[PDB]
Design a protein around this ligand. Structure first.
Ligand code: NA
Lengths: 297, 275
């Protein structure tokens, strides 16, 4: 088994550190496809992405919103890129009218005569798939956190009452599977100060975890800090600037394209300069995972 | 403004990019109201002076009509002002003003010559589009001389932390100046401090007197008050004394001016600065 010697720290006040040296998490979110190759996880294609990312100054990748191919883990191990490995997007509720997404299966039990192997099978699929990923990557120096979900309460139908209890279940399963890494998630409801988000973030922190906020600005980072002094936080998903390559005849956001000037972002996000400015000024914001590093299908 | 965000000055010019309509039948307080055919105007603005003279009006007030005028301004408040307080200040509106913000009626003000204000905080959309509306009703005859009509003086926005000096919140007295002139002069101050947060504040004031324009390096007196707890949602008058070292007199031939600056501290950090 491949191994590397390192330790990390997340501090509520001063942010992230690697082997005792303070370090900014200069990260991108990456989806899994490889462009014209479709979903095929070809090793050189994946390596080429990491190379191009590194030349930009990237030192970290968030595998949004699902386990990485082993090939990525291999490459980051050799290249020195810090990986936040995300396991899930939705939990037990489907998003965006996607009636056959994993929201259907998350909380289903596993048949006794189903011989599938890789993780624990004594509870639900969520436990099996969570443990199976951790089992695969528990020794990899590159992986520094397990992310347990993303915007779990977004795009779904019905009450969010049961979500705090589900989060705690996942946090307990992770701590029991691997005691050596913090767990985390990306929550977009923190910026809205939902009751469930406060409960969930407090439970993260109580188990040695780190809280990811999606799409907070500077003013909101500050509110989080004052409201939750015990949280160690970072921007788990940032910017969502929207741009085409090579478009100059307008600087603001007919040809079905968008300006290449950094003056265009989705309503909930921010342009690149803004999302960076807000983070780099704040030692207590450990870093940023920009949405996204590569365009995806 | 077209957009409000940090960091404009605490008090900033709000005169630009309004829309105006003269009509005593229109009802245009809703933010979704179509004002695309309205005039674009910068304030200060007088809508009597643009109308025609008429023998049906009064010689007393220059034979010019008054009337009902509506002012609309749509502007963005950026997300970065989220926990801040926002107020709009009118140095004068002639007369009978009615003010709405995002569709909510805030209140009214009859007198055409006195300054007034409205807190906008409770109705603001942070990180969105906002619409302030002012209805003005100069119903004639209201004056012995030409009054004019509308928002004829400047308009400002005031943006502050939850802990802040109140509106016009410092009073200064120098009751022994005549005797103390040329030596140490006793300034007796009273400062209203408001705590519009949900927790008690440990408040000290750092007050400085220095020549206008003008840096704090050249102060002639400062004081720091003892810590006073002001409860969440409460305000208090805070008395303080500044000993001013031989201030220069304000006279007709030499009108020396000073800035008196108030910094509000809670715990160890400055949250508000009032000159
Ligand atoms: Na791609």
């Amino acid at each position: 088994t491949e191994y590397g010697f390192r330790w990390t720290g997340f501090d509520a006040t001063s942010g992230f550190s690697l082997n005792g040296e303070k370090v900014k998490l200069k990260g991108v979110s990456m989806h899994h496809d490889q462009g014209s190759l479709g979903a095929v996880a070809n090793r050189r294609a994946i390596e080429r992405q990491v190379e191009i990312l590194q030349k930009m100054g990237v030192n970290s990748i968030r595998t949004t919103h699902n386990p990485a191919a082993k090939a990525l883990i291999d490459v980051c191990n050799e290249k020195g890129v810090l990986v936040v490995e995300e396991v899930f997007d939705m939990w037990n509720r489907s998003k965006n009218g996607n009636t056959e997404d994993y929201g259907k299966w998350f909380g289903q039990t596993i048949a006794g005569d189903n011989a599938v192997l890789g993780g624990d099978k004594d509870e639900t699929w969520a436990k099996f798939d969570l443990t199976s990923t951790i089992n695969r990557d528990r020794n990899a120096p590159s992986v520094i956190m397990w992310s347990l979900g993303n915007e779990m309460m977004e795009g779904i139908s019905g009450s969010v009452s049961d979500f705090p209890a589900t989060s705690a279940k996942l946090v307990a399963w992770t701590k029991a599977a691997d005691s050596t890494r913090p767990m985390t998630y990306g929550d977009n409801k923190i910026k809205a100060n939902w009751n469930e988000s406060n409960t969930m973030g407090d439970n993260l922190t109580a188990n040695g975890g780190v809280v990811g906020t999606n799409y907070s600005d500077g003013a909101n980072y500050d509110k989080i800090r004052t409201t939750h002094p015990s949280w160690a936080i970072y921007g788990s998903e940032t910017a969502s600037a929207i741009n085409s390559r090579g478009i100059y005849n307008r600087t603001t956001g007919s040809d079905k394209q968008l300006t290449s000037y950094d003056n265009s972002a989705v309503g909930w996000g921010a342009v690149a300069s803004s999302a960076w400015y807000d983070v780099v000024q704040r030692d207590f914001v450990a870093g940023t995972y920009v949405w996204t590093g590569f365009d995806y299908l | 403004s077209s957009a409000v965000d940090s960091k404009q000055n605490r008090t900033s010019d709000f005169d630009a990019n309004w829309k105006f309509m003269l009509s005593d039948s229109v009802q245009a307080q809703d933010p979704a109201f179509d004002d695309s055919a309205w005039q674009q105007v910068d304030l200060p603005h007088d809508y009597s002076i643009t109308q025609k003279y008429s023998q049906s009006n009064e010689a007393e007030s220059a034979y010019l009509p008054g009337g009902t005028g509506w002012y609309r301004k749509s502007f963005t408040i950026d997300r970065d002002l989220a926990g801040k307080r926002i107020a709009i200040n009118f140095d004068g509106v002639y007369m009978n003003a009615t003010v709405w913000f995002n569709g909510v009626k805030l209140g009214t003000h009859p007198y055409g010559y006195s300054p007034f204000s409205f807190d906008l905080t409770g109705n603001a959309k942070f990180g969105g589009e906002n619409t302030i509306v002012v209805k003005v009703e100069n119903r004639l005859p209201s004056s012995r001389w030409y009054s004019g009509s509308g928002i004829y003086r400047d308009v400002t926005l005031t943006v502050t932390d939850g802990v802040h000096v109140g509106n016009n919140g410092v009073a200064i007295k120098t009751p022994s100046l005549a005797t103390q002139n040329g030596g140490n002069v006793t300034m007796n101050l009273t400062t209203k401090v408001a705590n519009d947060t949900e927790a008690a504040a440990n408040i000290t004031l750092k007050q400085t007197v220095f020549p206008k324009g003008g840096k704090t390096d050249a102060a002639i007196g400062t004081v720091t008050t003892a810590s006073k707890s002001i409860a969440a949602g409460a305000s208090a008058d805070v008395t303080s004394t500044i000993t001013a070292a031989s201030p220069k007199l304000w006279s007709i031939k030499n009108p020396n001016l000073y800035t008196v600056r108030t910094e509000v501290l809670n715990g160890d950090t400055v949250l508000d600065t009032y000159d």
